[PDB]
Amino acid sequence: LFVALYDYEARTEDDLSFHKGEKFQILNSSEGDWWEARSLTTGETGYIPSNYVAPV
Amino acid sequence: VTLFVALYDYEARTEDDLSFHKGEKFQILNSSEGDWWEARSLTTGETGYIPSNYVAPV
Amino acid sequence: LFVALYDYEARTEDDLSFHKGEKFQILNSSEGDWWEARSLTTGETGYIPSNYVAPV
Amino acid sequence: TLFVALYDYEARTEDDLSFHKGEKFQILNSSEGDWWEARSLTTGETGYIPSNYVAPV
Amino acid sequence: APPLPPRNRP
Amino acid sequence: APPLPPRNR
Amino acid sequence: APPLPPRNRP
Amino acid sequence: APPLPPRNRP
């Protein structure tokens, strides 16, 4: 589980947009510094930048 | 297949770099060497290296 | 051994907080850019960002 | 295998190289991470440099 | 808001 | 203070 | 314009 | 002057 430290607006459809404080379940972190995640606020899935988050 | 778009302008720092404008589209030819990818510009047809934090998938 | 170049406030419980000038023993650097370290000022162990430090 | 500095850099440790923008380098070792062991072609000094401060010649 | 990391390989 | 690096996987 | 990433290994 | 990259692993 991770939490967002900053706001992020998606740059592409496969990105997740999110607000500071939003929480995530990480689905796939094996492809690089962009991780596939599930927003625990919306259930939406997409990639997030792994320097915008911190472990809960 | 694997298409990306430039989010910013970039001026080449070396001859093997591609210069590009924001909005330019690329075909990625080789991304296996690091954070600079070999790409083909779909506006000019030129090939060269681009910084992979200046782009997003289309 | 490494020395901190900046202050850092922990963003998670398993992070280490530290001041500039603090020295560390690195315990584990194989998991990425966050290293498990031991503070030689407090004896506290935790993760630190490896761009906040330099070799001594 | 020659690189030029795009910015000035003041060494943070003894094993680092300090350098000015425009200085040229022969890279001796780039397999350990983003800090590369280099030889300054201006001074002959060897040391580590941050590989985001340089571009190929 | 910090710089974004390089994108994942295609 | 510099930007933080991406978190470990 | 973000900072440039580290160059690829020679 | 851009941010420095993370140090090499010991």
Side-chain angles (χ1 to χ4, degrees), chain A residues 1-8 10-12 14-18 20-30 32-43 45-56:
Chain A
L1 251 57
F2 282 72
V3 61
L5 308 172
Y6 316 91
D7 303 324
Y8 175 71
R11 304 305 206 251
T12 169
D14 292 334
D15 280 4
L16 259 191
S17 291
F18 54 84
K20 177 174 168 45
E22 194 152 348
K23 308 251 182 315
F24 304 95
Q25 171 197 9
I26 309 299
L27 306 178
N28 183 2
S29 60
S30 73
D33 291 329
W34 293 76
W35 298 350
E36 196 190 5
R38 173 181 282 125
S39 169
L40 299 186
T41 293
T42 67
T45 64
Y47 282 86
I48 63 172
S50 64
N51 65 321
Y52 271 53
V53 299
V56 173

Side-chain angles (χ1 to χ4, degrees), chain E:
Chain E
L4 302 171
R7 288 280 172 170
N8 299 350
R9 288 190 55 199

Side-chain angles (χ1 to χ4, degrees), chain D residues 9 16 32-35 50 52-53, chain H residues 1-8:
Chain D
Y9 175 71
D16 278 5
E32 308 184 337
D34 290 327
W35 293 77
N52 66 322
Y53 270 53
Chain H
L4 300 175
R7 287 278 169 171
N8 298 349

Side-chain angles (χ1 to χ4, degrees), chain B residues 8 10 17 34-36 51 53-54, chain G residues 1-9:
Chain B
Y8 312 86
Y10 174 71
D17 279 4
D35 291 329
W36 294 76
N53 64 321
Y54 272 53
Chain G
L4 302 173
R7 285 281 170 171
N8 301 349
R9 288 187 55 202

